[PDB]
Write a protein that binds this ligand. Structure first.
Ligand SMILES: C=Cc1cc(C(=O)Nc2ccc(C(=N)N)cc2)c(-c2ccc(C(=O)NCC3CC3)nc2C(=O)O)cc1OC
Ligand SMILES: [Ca+2]
Length: 221
């Protein structure tokens, strides 16, 4: 996160860190045994780390649970980044409490202008990687502004959020993490040209398009 602020320990209780020897992506806890992340975060040997603030220090609220299964969206295209979403099932159910909690899925999509909270352990410079969780409040941008910023690249499964002036954005290492708006998971950190650059806002997977797939996948897995 570039141009954000220190969230505060465990104030974003649905935020997880995906670890394969080191933090490599964010994700969002959506029930006791499932995490949503970006498809481009797929790899084997994932340990999900819940209850994290400082990802380099054991502070006492963590739960470390290995993934039992990953499910990349059937239509994910790694060239265009369309359908950049993946589900991860935990080998055991997380113990839910005030510091480790699921985030609600949307029942309707969010509109341009809505303020959201974006969070992660990604780069803070447009190189410096933080140990504690960083946060950014940012608005969803209009579809037209998003398409104007990235001609020919924005599909109906993507939205832009942030600040066209630059200076405030998600970044490398934030990928897969949450965009939460009024208590609903509306986005997943997906892509963008550099970070916090003028006229290059962050691009996010549009979660509301995937709720039926998420629910039916969980129901059968
Ligand atoms: C969707 C495909 C896609 C995206 C990213 C990526 O950049 N997304 C990103 C997120 C937001 C913003 C923004 N809002 N401005 C911009 C871009 C990457 C990727 C490539 C390189 C590194 C890296 O160098 N990390 C640091 C180093 C420890 C490895 N990280 C990533 C990552 O997943 O974030 C890899 C992808 O498919 C292989
Ligand atoms: Ca920790």
């Amino acid at each position: 996160i570039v141009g954000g602020y220190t969230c505060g320990a465990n104030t974003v209780p649905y935020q997880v860190s995906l670890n394969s020897g080191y933090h490599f992506c964010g994700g969002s806890l959506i029930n006791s045994q499932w995490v949503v992340s970006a498809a481009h975060c797929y790899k084997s040997g994932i340990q999900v780390r819940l209850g994290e603030d400082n990802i380099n220090v054991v502070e006492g609220n963590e739960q470390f649970i290995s993934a039992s299964k990953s499910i990349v969206h059937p239509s994910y295209n790694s060239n265009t980044l369309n359908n950049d979403i993946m589900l991860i099932k935990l080998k055991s159910a997380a113990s839910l409490n005030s510091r480790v909690a699921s985030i609600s899925l949307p029942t309707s999509c969010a509109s341009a202008g809505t303020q959201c909270l974006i969070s992660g352990w990604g780069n803070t410079k447009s190189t410096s990687y933080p140990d504690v969780l960083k946060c950014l409040k940012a608005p969803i941008l209009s579809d037209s502004s998003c398409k104007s910023a990235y001609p020919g690249q924005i599909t109906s499964n993507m939205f832009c959020a942030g600040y066209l002036e630059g200076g405030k954005d998600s970044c490398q290492g934030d990928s897969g993490g949450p965009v939460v708006c009024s208590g609903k998971l509306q986005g997943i950190v997906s892509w963008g040209s550099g970070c916090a650059q003028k006229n290059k806002p962050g691009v996010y997977t549009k979660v509301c398009n995937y709720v039926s797939w998420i629910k039916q996948t969980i129901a059968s897995n």
